[PDB]
Amino acid sequence: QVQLQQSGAELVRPGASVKMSCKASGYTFTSYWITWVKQRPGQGLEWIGDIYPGSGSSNYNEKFKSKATLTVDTSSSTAYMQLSSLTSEDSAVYYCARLGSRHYFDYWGQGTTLTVSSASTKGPSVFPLAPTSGGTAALGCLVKDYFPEPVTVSWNSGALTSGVHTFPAVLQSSGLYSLSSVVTVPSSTYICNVNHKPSNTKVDKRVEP
């Protein structure tokens, strides 16, 4: 099928450049335009520009005319976008889409999350949460002080799924992130398996009263 696979997340220092890939498959790459979209949490979507792989011709939004640079490698069927001299305003999820025959983006890529920071990675400190309002009782994990995002929290290596709420990460005054993952169980063992890929911090933890 028609697929668009984007490159992995980037953590790049401000002032430096970043180059991301969108590997196209399942269609004649050189026949349809590829567009790039910026997505910052809260300020909607932004059109960066498009490129026709069979020509290398490109349209840019005058906003990003000097920020982004679009290229194509027709041999490997990959389209590229380079973001030069990065700033905090460039931290966003970058989507890559194929413009279809019927004048609409029919296929998209999963996206690449760009985090623009000079700070080096930080593994989280996992802490347990002490195990009754509303007939139920709760326990959990505090994944505290880590950078960048994200962390993957599961319970009983995936066995426990019901009543689990993995809260969204919060930015702390310290500049580091911190999320909670709580599992609600009523009157009738519990292990949390935290995983931070950026600093290879896979930490298991048993929550006991």
Binding site: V37, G42, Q43, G44, L45, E46, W47, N59, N61, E62, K63, Y95, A97, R102, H103, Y104, F105, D106, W108, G109, Q110, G111, S125, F127, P128, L129, A130, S133, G134, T136, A137, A138, G140, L142, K144, H165, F167, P168, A169, V170, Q172, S178, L179, S180, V182, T184
Partner: protein
């Protein structure tokens, strides 16, 4: 540089109701596009060239409008239609622009939260830092107030809030407030209370503990 203002900012709808979101443009535009985005996933083309439906888009969706006011309408809401809808304009002029999006949430009865307090872990107390967590479980609507109080004194600035996305099953939200103070200031005090104010609660609920 046509500015597309989308309204409402967020709205609620019970399955079966007629939903209509508007996209007002700063100047006249040639065409109007709409995208459906759910969390964790890339957007999806919903409506193209002001009124056509994209592949997969069901019959209940329809879009229309002209000049400075275009709209997306769902004849009868479904549970899977809870998502953010962004509009996007096209015109001979070059910057194709987008709206800030309308988040479409599901309506339901008011439900009071379940409150739980969490004293700092012994492991974290060794680390010289103390974190008291307060959980507000399964409640509706999203607006809930959390006042941390230490020895009856209102705390400020050292708390961080986080709210889950609306539940797939019961359509309620959960919230967590984390009070984080140094081990030094933690031992300077005894009673740690968490005061929750909500529409579903007749009077505020206070879960607490003594150090």
């Amino acid at each position: 540089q046509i500015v597309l203002t989308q309204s409402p900012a967020l709205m609620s709808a019970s399955p079966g109701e007629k939903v209509t979101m508007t996209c007002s443009a700063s100047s006249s535009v040639s065409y109007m596009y709409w995208y459906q985005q759910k969390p964790g996933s890339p957007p999806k083309s919903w409506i193209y060239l002001t009124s056509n439906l994209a592949s997969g888009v069901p019959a209940r969706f329809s879009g229309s409008g002209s000049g400075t006011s275009y709209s997306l309408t769902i004849s009868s809401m479904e549970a899977e239609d809870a998502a953010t809808y962004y509009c996007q304009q096209w015109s001979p002029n070059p910057p194709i622009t987008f709206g800030a999006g309308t988040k479409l949430e599901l309506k339901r009865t008011v439900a009071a939260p379940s409150v739980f307090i969490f004293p700092p872990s012994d492991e974290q107390l060794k680390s010289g830092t103390a974190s008291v967590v307060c959980l507000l479980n399964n409640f509706y609507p999203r607006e809930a107030k959390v006042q941390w109080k230490v020895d009856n004194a209102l705390q400020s600035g050292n708390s961080q809030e986080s709210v889950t996305e609306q539940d797939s099953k019961d359509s309620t939200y959960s919230l967590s407030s984390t009070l984080t103070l140094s081990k030094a200031d933690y031992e300077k005090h005894k009673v740690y209370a968490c005061e929750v104010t909500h529409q579903g609660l007749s009077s505020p609920v206070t879960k607490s503990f003594n150090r």
